[PDB]
Amino acid sequence: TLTYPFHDWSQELSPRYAQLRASDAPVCPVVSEGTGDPLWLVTRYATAVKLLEDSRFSSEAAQASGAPRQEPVELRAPGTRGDAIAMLREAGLRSVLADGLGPRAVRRHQGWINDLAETLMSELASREGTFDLAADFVEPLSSALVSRTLLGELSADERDLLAHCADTGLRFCGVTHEEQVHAFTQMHEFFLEHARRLAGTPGEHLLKLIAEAPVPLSDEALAEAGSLLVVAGFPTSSGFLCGALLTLLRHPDAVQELHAHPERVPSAVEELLRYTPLATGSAKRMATEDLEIDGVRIKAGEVVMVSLEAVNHDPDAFEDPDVFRPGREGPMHFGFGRGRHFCPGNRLARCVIEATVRAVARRPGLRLAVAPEEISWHEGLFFRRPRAIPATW
Ligand code: HEM
Ligand SMILES: O=C1N[C@@H](Cc2c[nH]c3ccccc23)C(=O)N2CCC[C@@H]12
Ligand SMILES: O=C1N[C@@H](Cc2c[nH]c3ccccc23)C(=O)N2CCC[C@@H]12
Ligand code: NA
């Protein structure tokens, strides 16, 4: 009877997640508000490990057109596959994905990412008055990450178009179904027209590595790779960096510790990934056969969701789970997932989060110019994001 998701669009997690977690079942039935599909929902760390490390629960099967699902419209342009990352690994591009997303990419890019973070923060510090950390720090930094490491250099109008498509398509509510579908169409048509151009510009952005890779990727396939990098890399990084700055600004003692002890910043990055919520939906997998999870039978074809926010706030895994405690020394967080589908963007994500944390830690006194309650949130996004983050020294 419980409908999903829980409309917890700000950083305050829905109390439903703790209620289910403490329930007597390790897996609980819900219904998709957007489709009426019955779904299963996992909220406990121990059960989540088991689900996401069992390859008979398939991610691709849960993404496929026609699967039971939490999202109101399919997350693809009509007529296209929608499984880009599978398709690129499919065509033998694991090596390419590693060179473009792995440690060597971070080594190529970490210099300018930290230069840009400081330059942005320095300019804001030079301002008389308040400023907006979302529009004035996160947007330029996340846009530069997308252009330089993922797609190739975008104009401001192209960045805005891709951001709008992602915000419109990656939603539970607040737009009509047809608008959502059309956002995916527009984004596909943008890369049908522009992916080869972007791939051909100088740089080592991933889309170039993909387009130049031996396998002849079609325009449609290269367009799907472009769309994947937007949906997976852009609203995620923007939303998270926004949420992480909010967390830091609400924990000046933690920031002061990092200012005095910069060697502690990596531990703080990992705690932000646990503590700061991002997705308002759930990672999900389809039972490819009849399966059982901690005693509950899951029939073939049924989809099991795991809320990574719920798992990350599981008190059986993390003591005082709702406390931001850098260095807490508990189990691995789920902010990048678990198992085979662990976020491949995790190296670049950690790079940009770390650069942001260090930029903040170097400048104590940075604070919200309004109360946390006065922050306004985009309602219905998959990936939480505030409308603005008024801030000042
Ligand atoms: C910056 C913050 C980011 C966060 C918090 C994050 C988080 C995640 C998580 C939790 C998943 C797993 C979803 C699942 O289990 O089904 C995932 C998957 C993925 N991420 Fe990230 N991500 C971020 C950034 C990025 C970036 C920058 C890229 C690439 C440029 C990226 C590329 C991907 C891809 C392609 C997948 C799909 C993996 C698969 O389904 O096999 N992510 N991400
Ligand atoms: O590569 C994928 N993986 C999963 C999880 C995911 C990772 N990043 C996402 C961004 C938005 C929605 C889902 C995800 C998925 O649902 N996918 C549909 C869009 C991208 C595709
Ligand atoms: O809210 C969602 N989360 C991702 C998984 C994910 C969980 N946490 C993430 C963080 C970054 C990227 C993806 C994820 C997913 O598969 N979805 C299908 C529709 C809703 C959407
Ligand atoms: Na798997």
Short mmCIF file of C-alpha atoms and ligand atoms in Angstrom, two decimals:
data_model
loop_
_atom_site.label_atom_id
_atom_site.label_comp_id
_atom_site.label_asym_id
_atom_site.label_seq_id
_atom_site.Cartn_x
_atom_site.Cartn_y
_atom_site.Cartn_z
CA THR A 1 0.00 0.00 0.00
CA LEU A 2 2.96 2.34 0.57
CA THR A 3 3.67 4.42 -2.56
CA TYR A 4 7.19 5.22 -3.76
CA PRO A 5 9.15 7.51 -3.69
CA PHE A 6 8.72 9.33 -0.41
CA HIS A 7 8.85 12.97 -1.65
CA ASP A 8 11.87 13.77 0.55
CA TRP A 9 13.28 16.30 -1.89
CA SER A 10 15.46 18.22 0.65
CA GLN A 11 18.31 16.75 2.74
CA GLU A 12 15.83 15.56 5.39
CA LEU A 13 15.39 11.86 4.59
CA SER A 14 11.86 10.54 4.70
CA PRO A 15 11.16 8.86 8.06
CA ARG A 16 9.65 5.99 6.05
CA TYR A 17 13.16 4.68 5.34
CA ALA A 18 13.93 4.16 9.04
CA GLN A 19 10.43 2.75 9.59
CA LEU A 20 10.88 0.06 6.94
CA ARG A 21 14.45 -0.61 8.06
CA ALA A 22 13.20 -1.36 11.58
CA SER A 23 10.25 -3.39 10.23
CA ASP A 24 10.26 -7.17 10.68
CA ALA A 25 10.83 -7.88 6.99
CA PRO A 26 14.27 -7.43 5.31
CA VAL A 27 12.44 -6.54 2.07
CA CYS A 28 9.21 -4.58 1.96
CA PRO A 29 6.58 -4.17 -0.75
CA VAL A 30 5.82 -0.75 -2.19
CA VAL A 31 3.97 0.55 -5.23
CA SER A 32 5.38 2.97 -7.79
CA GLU A 33 3.34 6.15 -7.59
CA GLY A 34 4.34 6.90 -11.18
CA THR A 35 3.43 3.57 -12.83
CA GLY A 36 1.49 1.55 -10.28
CA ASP A 37 4.11 -1.19 -10.59
CA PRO A 38 4.66 -3.30 -7.49
CA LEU A 39 8.27 -3.09 -6.29
CA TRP A 40 10.38 -4.41 -3.44
CA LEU A 41 12.42 -2.06 -1.26
CA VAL A 42 15.52 -2.82 0.77
CA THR A 43 16.77 -0.37 3.43
CA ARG A 44 19.25 -2.43 5.49
CA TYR A 45 23.00 -2.50 4.83
CA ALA A 46 23.39 -6.27 5.31
CA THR A 47 20.52 -7.11 2.98
CA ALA A 48 21.74 -4.55 0.43
CA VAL A 49 25.18 -6.13 0.26
CA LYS A 50 23.59 -9.50 -0.49
CA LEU A 51 21.29 -8.13 -3.20
CA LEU A 52 23.82 -5.99 -5.05
CA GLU A 53 26.54 -8.65 -4.98
CA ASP A 54 24.18 -11.36 -6.44
CA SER A 55 24.48 -11.16 -10.21
CA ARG A 56 21.17 -13.03 -10.66
CA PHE A 57 19.56 -9.72 -9.67
CA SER A 58 20.19 -7.88 -12.94
CA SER A 59 20.54 -4.15 -13.36
CA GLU A 60 20.19 -4.22 -17.13
CA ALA A 61 16.98 -6.22 -16.84
CA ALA A 62 15.57 -3.59 -14.48
CA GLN A 63 16.55 -0.81 -16.89
CA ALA A 64 15.02 -2.49 -19.92
CA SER A 65 12.04 -1.01 -21.69
CA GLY A 66 8.93 -2.52 -20.14
CA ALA A 67 10.45 -3.42 -16.78
CA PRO A 68 8.48 -2.66 -13.62
CA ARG A 69 9.88 0.60 -12.49
CA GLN A 70 9.80 3.49 -10.06
CA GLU A 71 10.27 6.28 -12.65
CA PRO A 72 7.18 7.68 -14.41
CA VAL A 73 8.62 7.51 -17.96
CA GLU A 74 11.31 5.37 -19.54
CA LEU A 75 14.81 6.84 -19.21
CA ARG A 76 15.61 6.70 -22.93
CA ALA A 77 14.77 8.43 -26.16
CA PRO A 78 11.96 6.41 -27.79
CA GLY A 79 13.38 4.00 -30.33
CA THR A 80 16.82 3.79 -28.72
CA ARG A 81 18.34 1.11 -26.50
CA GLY A 82 19.00 3.12 -23.33
CA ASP A 83 21.72 0.77 -22.06
CA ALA A 84 24.83 2.73 -23.03
CA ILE A 85 27.31 1.51 -20.40
CA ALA A 86 26.39 -2.11 -21.05
CA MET A 87 26.68 -1.43 -24.78
CA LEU A 88 30.14 0.13 -24.43
CA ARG A 89 31.42 -2.74 -22.28
CA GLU A 90 29.50 -4.94 -24.74
CA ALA A 91 31.66 -3.63 -27.60
CA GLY A 92 34.83 -4.32 -25.60
CA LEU A 93 35.56 -0.84 -24.23
CA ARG A 94 36.34 -1.63 -20.57
CA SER A 95 39.97 -0.66 -21.18
CA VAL A 96 38.86 2.64 -22.73
CA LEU A 97 36.43 3.38 -19.92
CA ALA A 98 39.30 2.79 -17.47
CA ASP A 99 41.77 5.10 -19.21
CA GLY A 100 39.12 7.82 -19.38
CA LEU A 101 37.60 7.45 -15.91
CA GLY A 102 40.34 5.76 -13.84
CA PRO A 103 43.40 6.90 -11.92
CA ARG A 104 45.23 8.03 -15.06
CA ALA A 105 42.37 10.37 -15.94
CA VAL A 106 42.39 11.83 -12.44
CA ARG A 107 46.12 12.39 -12.84
CA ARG A 108 45.51 14.23 -16.12
CA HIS A 109 42.74 16.42 -14.70
CA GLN A 110 43.26 16.93 -10.97
CA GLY A 111 45.57 19.91 -11.51
CA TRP A 112 43.12 22.14 -13.35
CA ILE A 113 40.18 20.92 -11.23
CA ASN A 114 41.83 22.17 -8.06
CA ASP A 115 43.03 25.36 -9.80
CA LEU A 116 39.45 26.01 -10.90
CA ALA A 117 38.04 25.31 -7.44
CA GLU A 118 40.45 27.79 -5.87
CA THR A 119 39.96 30.39 -8.58
CA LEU A 120 36.18 30.18 -8.15
CA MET A 121 36.34 30.37 -4.35
CA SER A 122 38.94 33.17 -4.51
CA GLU A 123 36.73 35.27 -6.78
CA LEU A 124 33.77 34.79 -4.44
CA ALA A 125 35.93 35.78 -1.48
CA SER A 126 36.81 38.98 -3.36
CA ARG A 127 33.10 39.90 -3.52
CA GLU A 128 31.46 42.41 -1.27
CA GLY A 129 28.25 40.81 -0.08
CA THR A 130 26.68 37.41 -0.56
CA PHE A 131 26.86 34.96 -3.40
CA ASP A 132 25.33 31.69 -4.57
CA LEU A 133 27.49 28.60 -4.20
CA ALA A 134 25.22 26.66 -6.55
CA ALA A 135 25.34 29.01 -9.53
CA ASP A 136 28.75 30.57 -8.79
CA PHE A 137 30.78 27.52 -7.70
CA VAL A 138 29.07 24.19 -8.33
CA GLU A 139 27.72 24.99 -11.79
CA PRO A 140 31.04 26.20 -13.29
CA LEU A 141 32.98 23.36 -11.62
CA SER A 142 30.59 20.58 -12.60
CA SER A 143 30.19 22.04 -16.09
CA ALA A 144 33.97 22.12 -16.51
CA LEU A 145 34.19 18.50 -15.31
CA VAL A 146 31.60 17.41 -17.89
CA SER A 147 33.19 19.37 -20.78
CA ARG A 148 36.82 18.61 -20.07
CA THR A 149 36.68 15.00 -18.87
CA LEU A 150 33.46 13.60 -20.42
CA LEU A 151 31.95 15.23 -23.53
CA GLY A 152 34.28 17.86 -24.96
CA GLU A 153 33.99 21.63 -24.66
CA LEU A 154 30.37 22.81 -24.52
CA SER A 155 29.12 26.32 -25.12
CA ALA A 156 27.06 27.88 -22.36
CA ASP A 157 23.89 27.35 -24.40
CA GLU A 158 24.77 23.66 -24.96
CA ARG A 159 25.51 23.16 -21.27
CA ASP A 160 22.18 24.79 -20.40
CA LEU A 161 20.30 22.61 -22.88
CA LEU A 162 21.87 19.41 -21.56
CA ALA A 163 21.28 20.49 -17.96
CA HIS A 164 17.62 21.27 -18.69
CA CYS A 165 17.08 17.92 -20.44
CA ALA A 166 18.63 16.09 -17.50
CA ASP A 167 16.57 18.05 -14.95
CA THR A 168 13.38 17.49 -16.94
CA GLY A 169 13.90 13.84 -17.78
CA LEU A 170 15.37 12.68 -14.46
CA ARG A 171 12.34 13.40 -12.36
CA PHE A 172 9.52 11.73 -10.47
CA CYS A 173 7.06 14.62 -10.84
CA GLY A 174 6.67 18.30 -11.70
CA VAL A 175 6.58 17.90 -15.50
CA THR A 176 4.16 16.12 -17.83
CA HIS A 177 5.10 12.66 -19.03
CA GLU A 178 5.39 13.88 -22.61
CA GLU A 179 7.80 16.68 -21.60
CA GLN A 180 9.96 14.13 -19.81
CA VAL A 181 10.06 11.81 -22.82
CA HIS A 182 10.84 14.74 -25.07
CA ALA A 183 13.78 15.77 -22.88
CA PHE A 184 15.38 12.41 -23.62
CA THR A 185 14.54 12.86 -27.31
CA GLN A 186 16.12 16.31 -27.39
CA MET A 187 19.25 15.11 -25.63
CA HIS A 188 19.59 12.17 -28.10
CA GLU A 189 19.09 14.47 -31.10
CA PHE A 190 21.70 16.90 -29.70
CA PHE A 191 24.29 14.14 -29.65
CA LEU A 192 23.13 12.77 -33.00
CA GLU A 193 24.08 16.17 -34.43
CA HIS A 194 27.06 17.01 -32.20
CA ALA A 195 28.73 13.92 -30.66
CA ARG A 196 31.12 13.35 -33.54
CA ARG A 197 32.10 17.03 -33.48
CA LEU A 198 32.68 17.00 -29.72
CA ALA A 199 34.59 13.74 -29.98
CA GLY A 200 36.83 15.27 -32.63
CA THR A 201 38.01 18.26 -30.65
CA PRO A 202 41.40 18.18 -28.97
CA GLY A 203 41.59 16.69 -25.50
CA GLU A 204 41.32 13.30 -23.81
CA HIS A 205 37.66 13.64 -22.78
CA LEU A 206 36.02 10.23 -22.57
CA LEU A 207 33.63 10.69 -25.51
CA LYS A 208 36.66 11.18 -27.79
CA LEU A 209 38.33 8.02 -26.46
CA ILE A 210 35.07 6.17 -27.08
CA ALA A 211 34.61 7.49 -30.61
CA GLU A 212 38.24 6.75 -31.56
CA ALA A 213 38.15 3.27 -30.08
CA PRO A 214 38.57 0.12 -32.18
CA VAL A 215 35.63 -2.27 -32.20
CA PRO A 216 32.88 1.54 -36.00
CA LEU A 217 30.44 2.98 -33.43
CA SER A 218 27.38 4.33 -35.18
CA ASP A 219 26.08 7.86 -34.65
CA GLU A 220 23.18 6.45 -32.62
CA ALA A 221 25.57 4.48 -30.40
CA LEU A 222 27.89 7.44 -29.91
CA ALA A 223 24.83 9.59 -29.17
CA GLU A 224 23.77 7.14 -26.46
CA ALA A 225 27.26 7.35 -24.95
CA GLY A 226 26.86 11.13 -24.86
CA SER A 227 23.46 10.91 -23.20
CA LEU A 228 24.84 8.45 -20.62
CA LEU A 229 27.65 10.77 -19.64
CA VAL A 230 25.16 13.60 -19.13
CA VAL A 231 22.63 11.68 -17.08
CA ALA A 232 25.21 9.79 -15.04
CA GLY A 233 27.78 12.57 -14.60
CA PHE A 234 26.13 15.97 -14.64
CA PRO A 235 23.07 16.16 -12.30
CA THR A 236 24.76 13.67 -9.98
CA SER A 237 27.93 15.72 -9.58
CA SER A 238 26.00 19.01 -9.41
CA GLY A 239 23.52 17.71 -6.85
CA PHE A 240 26.15 16.06 -4.73
CA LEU A 241 28.56 18.98 -4.68
CA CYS A 242 25.64 21.21 -3.70
CA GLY A 243 24.60 18.83 -0.92
CA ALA A 244 28.17 18.42 0.31
CA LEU A 245 28.69 22.18 0.59
CA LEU A 246 25.48 22.40 2.61
CA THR A 247 26.79 19.64 4.90
CA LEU A 248 30.13 21.41 5.34
CA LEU A 249 28.50 24.78 6.02
CA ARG A 250 26.34 23.19 8.70
CA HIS A 251 29.43 21.64 10.38
CA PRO A 252 31.90 24.47 11.02
CA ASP A 253 33.69 22.41 13.69
CA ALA A 254 34.37 19.71 11.10
CA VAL A 255 35.61 22.32 8.63
CA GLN A 256 37.89 23.85 11.30
CA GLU A 257 39.41 20.41 11.94
CA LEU A 258 40.06 20.01 8.20
CA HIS A 259 41.58 23.50 8.05
CA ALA A 260 44.05 22.58 10.80
CA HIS A 261 44.61 19.00 9.54
CA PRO A 262 44.41 18.89 5.73
CA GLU A 263 45.48 15.25 5.76
CA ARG A 264 42.01 14.47 7.13
CA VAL A 265 40.21 15.74 4.02
CA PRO A 266 39.99 12.33 2.26
CA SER A 267 38.23 10.85 5.29
CA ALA A 268 35.82 13.78 5.12
CA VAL A 269 35.18 13.14 1.41
CA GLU A 270 34.21 9.55 2.21
CA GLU A 271 31.96 10.64 5.09
CA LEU A 272 30.22 13.20 2.83
CA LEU A 273 29.56 10.35 0.40
CA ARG A 274 27.89 8.41 3.23
CA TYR A 275 26.15 11.30 4.99
CA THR A 276 24.99 13.61 2.23
CA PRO A 277 21.90 12.23 0.47
CA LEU A 278 21.65 12.36 -3.30
CA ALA A 279 19.15 10.13 -5.06
CA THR A 280 15.50 10.40 -4.12
CA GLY A 281 14.86 7.04 -5.75
CA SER A 282 16.68 3.74 -5.41
CA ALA A 283 19.19 1.61 -7.20
CA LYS A 284 17.33 -1.41 -8.50
CA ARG A 285 17.72 -4.91 -9.93
CA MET A 286 15.41 -7.46 -11.51
CA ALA A 287 15.27 -11.07 -10.38
CA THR A 288 16.30 -13.03 -13.46
CA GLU A 289 14.94 -16.20 -11.82
CA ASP A 290 13.12 -17.06 -8.62
CA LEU A 291 15.37 -15.96 -5.79
CA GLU A 292 15.26 -15.52 -2.05
CA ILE A 293 16.65 -12.69 -0.02
CA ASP A 294 16.92 -13.18 3.74
CA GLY A 295 13.97 -15.56 3.58
CA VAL A 296 11.62 -13.57 1.33
CA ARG A 297 10.81 -15.10 -2.08
CA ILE A 298 11.41 -12.83 -5.08
CA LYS A 299 9.76 -14.13 -8.25
CA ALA A 300 11.52 -13.90 -11.59
CA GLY A 301 10.71 -10.56 -13.18
CA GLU A 302 10.16 -8.69 -9.92
CA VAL A 303 12.31 -5.63 -9.26
CA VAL A 304 14.06 -5.04 -5.94
CA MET A 305 15.10 -1.49 -5.02
CA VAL A 306 17.84 -0.53 -2.59
CA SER A 307 17.79 2.99 -1.22
CA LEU A 308 21.46 3.90 -0.88
CA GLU A 309 20.50 6.76 1.44
CA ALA A 310 18.69 4.31 3.72
CA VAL A 311 21.64 1.90 3.73
CA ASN A 312 24.08 4.72 4.38
CA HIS A 313 21.97 5.73 7.42
CA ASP A 314 21.56 2.18 8.79
CA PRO A 315 22.39 2.30 12.54
CA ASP A 316 23.32 -1.40 12.46
CA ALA A 317 26.14 -0.42 10.08
CA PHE A 318 27.05 3.08 11.29
CA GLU A 319 26.89 4.17 14.91
CA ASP A 320 24.90 7.40 15.21
CA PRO A 321 24.16 7.25 11.49
CA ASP A 322 22.68 10.73 11.33
CA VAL A 323 25.89 12.36 12.67
CA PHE A 324 28.42 13.77 10.20
CA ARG A 325 31.61 12.20 11.64
CA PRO A 326 34.64 12.29 9.34
CA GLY A 327 36.97 9.39 10.31
CA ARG A 328 34.11 7.39 11.89
CA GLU A 329 35.87 4.06 10.84
CA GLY A 330 32.78 1.85 10.03
CA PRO A 331 32.06 -0.26 6.93
CA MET A 332 32.35 0.95 3.33
CA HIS A 333 29.59 3.42 2.38
CA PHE A 334 27.11 2.93 -0.48
CA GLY A 335 27.33 6.42 -1.98
CA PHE A 336 28.84 4.89 -5.13
CA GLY A 337 26.86 1.67 -4.83
CA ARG A 338 28.11 -1.84 -4.41
CA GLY A 339 29.40 -4.71 -6.54
CA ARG A 340 29.73 -4.90 -10.30
CA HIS A 341 27.86 -1.64 -10.92
CA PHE A 342 29.96 0.43 -8.53
CA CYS A 343 30.10 3.97 -9.91
CA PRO A 344 32.84 4.10 -12.60
CA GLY A 345 32.83 7.87 -12.21
CA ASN A 346 33.94 7.43 -8.61
CA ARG A 347 37.54 8.51 -9.24
CA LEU A 348 36.55 11.78 -10.98
CA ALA A 349 33.75 12.33 -8.47
CA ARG A 350 36.14 11.92 -5.55
CA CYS A 351 38.59 14.26 -7.29
CA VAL A 352 36.09 17.06 -7.60
CA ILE A 353 34.59 16.54 -4.14
CA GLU A 354 38.08 16.58 -2.61
CA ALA A 355 38.97 19.78 -4.51
CA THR A 356 35.78 21.37 -3.21
CA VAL A 357 36.37 20.27 0.39
CA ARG A 358 39.93 21.61 0.35
CA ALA A 359 38.79 24.90 -1.18
CA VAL A 360 36.31 25.24 1.69
CA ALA A 361 38.73 24.09 4.38
CA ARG A 362 41.28 26.70 3.33
CA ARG A 363 38.74 29.48 3.98
CA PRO A 364 37.05 29.02 7.35
CA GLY A 365 34.23 31.40 8.08
CA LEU A 366 32.33 30.55 4.93
CA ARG A 367 28.72 30.25 6.04
CA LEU A 368 25.16 30.09 4.80
CA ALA A 369 23.65 33.54 4.34
CA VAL A 370 20.21 32.10 5.20
CA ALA A 371 18.98 29.41 7.58
CA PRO A 372 19.09 25.82 6.26
CA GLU A 373 15.27 25.80 6.39
CA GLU A 374 15.19 28.77 4.01
CA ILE A 375 16.98 26.85 1.29
CA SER A 376 14.68 26.10 -1.64
CA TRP A 377 14.83 22.69 -3.32
CA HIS A 378 14.06 21.53 -6.82
CA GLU A 379 11.06 19.29 -6.24
CA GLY A 380 10.98 15.83 -7.80
CA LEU A 381 14.51 15.48 -9.16
CA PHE A 382 16.07 12.05 -8.91
CA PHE A 383 19.24 13.81 -7.75
CA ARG A 384 18.55 16.33 -4.99
CA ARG A 385 19.64 19.87 -5.68
CA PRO A 386 18.92 23.25 -4.04
CA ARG A 387 17.73 26.13 -6.20
CA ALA A 388 20.48 28.33 -4.69
CA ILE A 389 22.93 28.26 -1.80
CA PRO A 390 23.22 31.85 -0.49
CA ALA A 391 26.56 32.13 1.28
CA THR A 392 29.06 34.69 2.61
CA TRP A 393 32.24 35.27 4.65
C1 HEM B 1 29.71 12.98 -8.53
C2 HEM B 1 28.90 12.18 -7.82
C3 HEM B 1 28.46 10.77 -8.28
C4 HEM B 1 27.80 9.93 -7.49
C5 HEM B 1 27.43 10.18 -6.02
C6 HEM B 1 27.56 8.73 -8.25
C7 HEM B 1 26.91 7.62 -7.80
C8 HEM B 1 26.67 6.49 -8.53
C9 HEM B 1 26.02 5.30 -8.02
C10 HEM B 1 25.50 5.13 -6.58
C11 HEM B 1 25.90 4.42 -9.02
C12 HEM B 1 25.33 2.99 -8.91
C13 HEM B 1 23.90 2.86 -9.39
C14 HEM B 1 23.43 1.41 -9.29
O1 HEM B 1 23.88 0.63 -8.40
O2 HEM B 1 22.55 1.01 -10.11
C15 HEM B 1 26.52 5.00 -10.19
C16 HEM B 1 26.59 4.43 -11.44
C17 HEM B 1 27.21 5.02 -12.53
N1 HEM B 1 27.94 6.21 -12.53
FE1 HEM B 1 28.18 7.47 -10.95
N2 HEM B 1 28.05 8.89 -9.53
C18 HEM B 1 28.61 10.15 -9.58
C19 HEM B 1 29.29 10.68 -10.66
C20 HEM B 1 29.52 10.05 -11.85
C21 HEM B 1 30.28 10.59 -12.96
C22 HEM B 1 31.01 11.94 -12.97
C23 HEM B 1 30.26 9.66 -13.92
C24 HEM B 1 30.86 9.60 -15.32
C25 HEM B 1 31.34 10.68 -15.90
C26 HEM B 1 29.48 8.53 -13.45
C27 HEM B 1 29.19 7.44 -14.21
C28 HEM B 1 28.40 6.41 -13.82
C29 HEM B 1 27.95 5.32 -14.64
C30 HEM B 1 28.23 5.18 -16.16
C31 HEM B 1 27.23 4.49 -13.87
C32 HEM B 1 26.50 3.19 -14.30
C33 HEM B 1 27.22 1.94 -13.84
C34 HEM B 1 26.43 0.68 -14.16
O3 HEM B 1 25.17 0.75 -14.17
O4 HEM B 1 27.05 -0.39 -14.44
N3 HEM B 1 29.07 8.78 -12.17
N4 HEM B 1 26.96 6.26 -9.86
O1 LIG B 2 24.04 3.18 -16.68
C1 LIG B 2 23.00 3.14 -16.09
N1 LIG B 2 22.86 2.46 -14.86
C2 LIG B 2 21.62 2.42 -14.14
C3 LIG B 2 21.87 3.25 -12.78
C4 LIG B 2 22.13 4.79 -13.02
C5 LIG B 2 23.44 5.25 -13.02
N2 LIG B 2 23.42 6.61 -13.25
C6 LIG B 2 22.11 7.00 -13.38
C7 LIG B 2 21.50 8.26 -13.60
C8 LIG B 2 20.11 8.37 -13.71
C9 LIG B 2 19.32 7.24 -13.54
C10 LIG B 2 19.92 6.00 -13.33
C11 LIG B 2 21.32 5.88 -13.24
C12 LIG B 2 20.36 2.99 -14.72
O2 LIG B 2 19.30 2.94 -14.16
N3 LIG B 2 20.53 3.69 -15.98
C13 LIG B 2 19.53 4.52 -16.89
C14 LIG B 2 20.28 5.68 -17.15
C15 LIG B 2 21.82 5.32 -16.95
C16 LIG B 2 21.69 3.76 -16.67
O1 LIG B 3 16.81 7.69 -7.99
C1 LIG B 3 17.37 7.00 -8.78
N1 LIG B 3 18.58 6.33 -8.51
C2 LIG B 3 19.22 5.55 -9.54
C3 LIG B 3 20.26 4.59 -8.84
C4 LIG B 3 21.17 5.55 -8.00
C5 LIG B 3 21.03 5.56 -6.62
N2 LIG B 3 21.87 6.52 -6.11
C6 LIG B 3 22.51 7.11 -7.18
C7 LIG B 3 23.46 8.15 -7.28
C8 LIG B 3 23.96 8.54 -8.51
C9 LIG B 3 23.50 7.93 -9.68
C10 LIG B 3 22.57 6.92 -9.59
C11 LIG B 3 22.08 6.51 -8.34
C12 LIG B 3 18.32 4.73 -10.40
O2 LIG B 3 18.56 3.64 -10.81
N3 LIG B 3 17.09 5.42 -10.70
C13 LIG B 3 15.86 4.93 -11.58
C14 LIG B 3 14.93 5.96 -11.51
C15 LIG B 3 15.26 6.78 -10.21
C16 LIG B 3 16.85 6.70 -10.22
NA NA B 4 25.98 -7.72 -11.03
#
